[PDB]
Structure 1
Amino acid sequence: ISPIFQGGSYQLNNKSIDISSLLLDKLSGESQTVVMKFKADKPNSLQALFGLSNSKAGFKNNYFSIFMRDSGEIGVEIRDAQKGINYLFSRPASLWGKHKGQAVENTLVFVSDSKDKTYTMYVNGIEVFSETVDTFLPISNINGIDKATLGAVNREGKEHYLAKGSIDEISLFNKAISDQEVSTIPLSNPFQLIFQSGDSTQANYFRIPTLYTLSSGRVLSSIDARYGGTHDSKSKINIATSYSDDNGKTWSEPIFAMKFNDYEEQLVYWPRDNKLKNSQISGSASFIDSSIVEDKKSGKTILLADVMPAGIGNNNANKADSGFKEINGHYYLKLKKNGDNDFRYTVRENGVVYNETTNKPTNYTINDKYEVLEGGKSLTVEQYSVDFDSGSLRERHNGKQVPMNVFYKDSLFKVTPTNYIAMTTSQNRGESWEQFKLLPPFLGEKHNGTYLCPGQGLALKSSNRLIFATYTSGELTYLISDDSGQTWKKSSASIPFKNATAEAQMVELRDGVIRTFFRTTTGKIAYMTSRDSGETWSKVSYIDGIQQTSYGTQVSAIKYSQLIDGKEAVILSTPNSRSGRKGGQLVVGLVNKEDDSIDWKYHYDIDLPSYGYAYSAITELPNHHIGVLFEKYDSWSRNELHLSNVVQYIDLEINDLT
């Protein structure tokens, strides 16, 4: 199983390289494998890395290519006019450009398999497409092929899709190699995956990364395990965690911090065509947006996430309602029973379901896990599974029974179709998690729940104060606990925005001084300061020198433990672009101890300015390196939905940033 052609160190400088004499007469049979290690840190908009063409007059559409875009996208064309075949397979956000100054060696493995009638592309260990066709076109069975080309496609005597870049190594095989052989091919990745397709979560997609360094040196990570593509809603989403005991080098197989069982955890390949991509798992309860903090006093780890029941909608579900009823000075969770038109029930002390019309209790109780019992007996519902077999999404019962949960569609008692905030705890630094409890309303009976700011909570150095940032319309709503997260109070901070996704992260500049950096609708990152450990908050200011899009992106922030250029330092992670979610940066600021102002002195580009960078998580690792877990793609763009393994982790050192 050795190569028919092996070549190396080609410089693609807007001048194609001819290798027809070397390669073309080696090609035989209808299955081929291409293996290519290449760099491209200054690509053109659209460029071919490799081409097989009929270069003769009138055959401009008879060619095979492997091409890329300056967006990071990779693909192949397979075209033959006489066969009436023009195939194009691609996937956005498949490449790296740069890392720590140097251009990245990408490893591309393209497999064209005549027997299975399938083409498959891997880049840097990740399968980015696998396509089966009715009519298969062998890549060198294109009518009249007479040219083999590097750095362009030769069409009618001319160079199309001229490439800037280089190909350190290229190999060809007259075989379709096995998925196993592929995994034996060494890579040169600048990144690693913590969460990934096929792992214990069985989720094909991930979004919203978090990181937090625990006091034992264990680094913890949480994330949305998203099942119905990368949709926020409607969908199935669990909250999954993993940890690292070796400074980010290896990571534990993930577990769930928050999960529902009304729908099966399915690894699904969600459609990316324009007709089907907005398909949504519509009948599932789910979570979204996790946040982590560690309490120095009890040693617990605390994780919060937004929760939604199955019946949640977009509009008319259910703003102006918290889902709780105030009775005296206490909040009880509202329920609605099957046939009723209103919420005539509540969950009082020790889960007893009271009938509000008669104020008399029922023979139903609600347990620790929000499950329904009648006379102490576990009621159950049937689970759903999703498929695209009928050429469209179906959600159907699957025979398996699961505990009846008040967040479910099939449940006898239902919660208000709005958003809530749930909290869980681990006493073993992420090895297991308790059943979550719902947090009570903070803005009164008649106000839908605020939105958790994904990332980290803040543990104040000089006390036992724990703070979680949330957002609602017109304000940041901080959640403050002084008793290991047993009780919470809110601290409201007005912002100049109605209906913003004001995702906020905090750093402590010095004892009792919190700066919160948050996403806005102005194209600039905002901030406010507290000087009383979160009791009161300043007016809002903005950062210049960094740009976001109008709709904006989540920003992550940490106080660096070490001085830089003699001054105390803060690190921000964010896209730097007013067009999309690309141009990822780590920005280093030094604090002016006279006014607590921040001079943003250093900008580190995570990859190319045109390459995808979205939601992110930063942590200072015990060895003082920096770990970054991030969405390496444009998670806003309607053209980059439902990609697998784009959430990635890198290790950086401070000198890398300066």
Structure 2
Amino acid sequence: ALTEKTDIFESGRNGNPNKDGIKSYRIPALLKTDKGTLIAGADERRLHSSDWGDIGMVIRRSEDNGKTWGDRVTITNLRDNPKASDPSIGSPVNIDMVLVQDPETKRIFSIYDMFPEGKGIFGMSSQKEEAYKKIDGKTYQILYREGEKGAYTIRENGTVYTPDGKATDYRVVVDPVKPAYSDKGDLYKGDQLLGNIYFTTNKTSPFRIAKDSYLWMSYSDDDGKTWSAPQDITPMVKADWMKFLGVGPGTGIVLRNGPHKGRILIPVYTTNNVSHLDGSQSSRVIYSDDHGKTWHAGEAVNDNRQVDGQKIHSSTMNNRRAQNTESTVVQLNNGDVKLFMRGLTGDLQVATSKDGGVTWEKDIKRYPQVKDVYVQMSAIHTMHEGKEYIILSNAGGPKRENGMVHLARVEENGELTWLKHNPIQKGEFAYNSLQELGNGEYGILYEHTEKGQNAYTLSFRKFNWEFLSK
């Protein structure tokens, strides 16, 4: 019923780097393509297991349903600041991905966070820095020059314009060409490399982007073999009030029925400037109706939500327990969208959208049958013999341990009836990503450590309906 674990991304041991010089792997995403390929994505955390530093967005492909795996394809890996005093925080950061395939165009998307050099979500400034400027109907990324108040802009061809709208002799690499696109943001004067717009300390160039939270996208048209250069989707989806805006890691969905059929959903979450990570983490989705060309923000589950007899908003809330963070998204046969949200209640929180993920119903459903220890989860839709189900995997607890696979029957009204709860991994268990394999078989890429492994090694297992019914 259930296979042995095949390690896909292997972490180092006892606090040391593995043989490739990588201490850590984190944040699995598992995608089954139209060819039948399995794409396994991960944070490649070179220097340590923490949520920052030098991190590549990496995939491996299985052209045989999880039996054997090809070599690592690196989607994006921004080069580190060679002059940073502390290399553990000395790199521009990419962190956390969501994979999805457009079932019509066959395009595969990787959407992931981006920060300039520093500590990621843990090094955000208290004060807003404007990141973008609209000039004659065009949106440009801003640059700040040391000692100057004014907003420089990156305009056509990467050419840097002054605050007062004059071209300079500086340009930015806006069309990176190097492997892993490690030249992105490089700042030139002519053909002299000066530095990089993502460096924040001990800079050798005069320019940097706003110290903010960004959202990037990369895509593949050849089943995950090669990848586009990073596309900055931030200004399409990030409101002025948002502090953090980042993905809920794993695998997104494409709506298969109802008025919004073909819509791509990407779970994300925000914080605000009132209470940031202490009281404002709020789930929502971004979506595309045009096959991934343009992106829109849905409303938050927390927007106009009644809490303890009073209305809150994702932009103003300061309520630790009312937060919802990383989430996993599923569309039902009746057309409802369910959002399963990592939260702080001890048990499973679920929001429902009747309009394709744009707005959410007033109640969040809490399911005591499914434990949540405040950790990522995944959930997928599945049809077994014409009956409708959802499979959800997360840690059983009491800590980030004991991988549980849950089975729910979905009722005609969209309610969830939990049937079975089946252990899939003893010991350490954290982030995971489920897929349908196409028989009655299901795949799962997850975080687990054993035998002194650094957090985490990411492993793959198959399981059938015989395992689910147990």
Provide TM-score, normalisation by structure 2: 0.82
Match of 2:133 among 320, 325, 332: 325
2-side partners of 1:298 and 1:329: how far apart?
A: 29
1:223–1:263 distance in 2 versus 1, CA, 3 Å: farther
Instruction: Pick the structure with greater CA Rg.
Output: 1
1:303–1:430 distance in 2 versus 1, CA, 3 Å: same
Q: What is aligned with 1:537? A: 360
Q: What is aligned with 2:268? A: 470
2-side partners of 1:633 and 1:423: how far apart?
A: 30
Contact 1:335 1:347 in 2 (8 A): yes
Match of 2:73 among 252, 255, 259: 255
Contact 1:624 1:653 in 2 (8 A): yes
Q: Secondary structure in 2 aligned to 1:655?
A: helix
1:91-113 CA-partner distances (Å, limit 9, x unpaired): xxxxxxxx95xxxxxxxxxxxxx
In the TM superposition, what are the counterparts of 1:46-85 in structure 2 within 5 Å? none
1-side partners of 2:285 and 2:126: how far apart?
A: 22
Match of 2:252 among 451, 457, 460: 457
Deviation of residue 454 (structure 1)?
Answer: 0.4
1:489–1:653 distance in 2 versus 1, CA, 3 Å: same
Contact 2:124 2:211 in 1 (8 A): no
Contact 2:26 2:456 in 1 (8 A): no
Amino acid in structure 2 at the alignment position of 1:190 = E
In the TM superposition, what are the counterparts of 1:550-569 in structure 2 within 5 Å? 552-563=374-385, 567-569=387-389
Question: Is it true that 1:195 corresponds to 2:26 in the alignment?
Answer: no
1:302–1:308 distance in 2 versus 1, CA, 3 Å: same
Amino acid in structure 2 at the alignment position of 1:572 = L
Amino acid in structure 2 at the alignment position of 1:335 = L
2-side partners of 1:476 and 1:644: how far apart?
A: 25
1:450-494 CA-partner distances (Å, limit 9, x unpaired): 121100121112433111111013532311111121111111123
Question: Is it true that 1:606 corresponds to 2:424 in the alignment?
Answer: yes
Contact 2:62 2:68 in 1 (8 A): yes
Contact 2:37 2:61 in 1 (8 A): yes
1:347-380 CA-partner distances (Å, limit 9, x unpaired): 2333221211x22221222222333454652515
Q: What is aligned with 1:651? A: 462
Match of 1:427 among 221, 224, 238: 221
2-side partners of 1:371 and 1:596: how far apart?
A: 46
1:529–1:347 distance in 2 versus 1, CA, 3 Å: same
1:343–1:232 distance in 2 versus 1, CA, 3 Å: farther
1-side partners of 2:102 and 2:152: how far apart?
A: 36
Amino acid in structure 2 at the alignment position of 1:542 = R
Question: Is it true that 1:620 corresponds to 2:456 in the alignment?
Answer: no
1:449–1:411 distance in 2 versus 1, CA, 3 Å: farther
Q: What is aligned with 1:221? A: 40
In the TM superposition, what are the counterparts of 1:392-411 in structure 2 within 5 Å? 404=196, 406-407=198-199, 409=201, 410=203
Match of 1:548 among 352, 359, 372: 372
1:315–1:241 distance in 2 versus 1, CA, 3 Å: closer
1-side partners of 2:419 and 2:453: how far apart?
A: 36
1-side partners of 2:81 and 2:165: how far apart?
A: 34
2-side partners of 1:510 and 1:613: how far apart?
A: 31
Contact 2:216 2:232 in 1 (8 A): yes
Question: Is it true that 1:437 corresponds to 2:255 in the alignment?
Answer: no
Contact 2:337 2:354 in 1 (8 A): yes
In the TM superposition, what are the counterparts of 1:33-432 in structure 2 within 5 Å? 100=2, 190-197=4-11, 202-233=21-52, 235-262=53-80, 281-311=88-118, 314-315=122-123, 317=125, 320-321=128-129, 323-327=131-135, 330-337=138-145, 339-342=146-149, 344-356=151-163, 358-366=164-172, 367-369=174-176, 370-372=184-186, 374=188, 376-377=190-191, 379=193, 381=195, 404=196, 406-407=198-199, 409=201, 410=203, 412=205, 413-432=207-226
Q: Secondary structure in 1 aligned to 2:467?
A: helix
Q: What is aligned with 1:571? A: 391
Deviation of residue 446 (structure 1)?
Answer: 4.7
2-side partners of 1:439 and 1:380: how far apart?
A: 26
2-side partners of 1:575 and 1:568: how far apart?
A: 24
Q: Secondary structure in 2 aligned to 1:600?
A: strand
CA-atom RMSD, angstroms? 2.8
Question: Is it true that 1:527 corresponds to 2:346 in the alignment?
Answer: no
Contact 1:557 1:573 in 2 (8 A): yes
1-side partners of 2:366 and 2:227: how far apart?
A: 38
1-side partners of 2:204 and 2:166: how far apart?
A: 21
2-side partners of 1:236 and 1:330: how far apart?
A: 32
Match of 1:507 among 330, 342, 352: 330
1:252–1:405 distance in 2 versus 1, CA, 3 Å: farther
2-side partners of 1:448 and 1:651: how far apart?
A: 39
2-side partners of 1:208 and 1:423: how far apart?
A: 16
Deviation of residue 571 (structure 1)?
Answer: 0.2
Q: What is aligned with 1:123? A: none
Deviation of residue 505 (structure 1)?
Answer: 0.7
1:606–1:309 distance in 2 versus 1, CA, 3 Å: same
Amino acid in structure 1 at the alignment position of 2:48 = G
Provide the aligned length of Structure 1 versus Structure 2.
Answer: 420
Contact 1:332 1:347 in 2 (8 A): yes
Amino acid in structure 2 at the alignment position of 1:368 = D
Q: Secondary structure in 2 aligned to 1:657?
A: helix
Contact 1:305 1:452 in 2 (8 A): yes
Provide TM-score, normalisation by structure 1: 0.59
Deviation of residue 583 (structure 1)?
Answer: 2.0
- What runs of 5+ residues in structure 2 fail to find an aligned partner? 13-17, 177-183, 272-279, 308-316
- What runs of 5+ residues in structure 1 fail to find an aligned partner? 1-98, 101-188, 265-278, 382-403, 635-639
Contact 1:419 1:449 in 2 (8 A): yes
Query: Which protein, 1 or 2, shows the higher relative CO under an 8 Å CA cutoff with sep ≥ 6?
Result: 2
1:567-617 CA-partner distances (Å, limit 9, x unpaired): 30100001122x311121000000111x21111101111134xx2211111
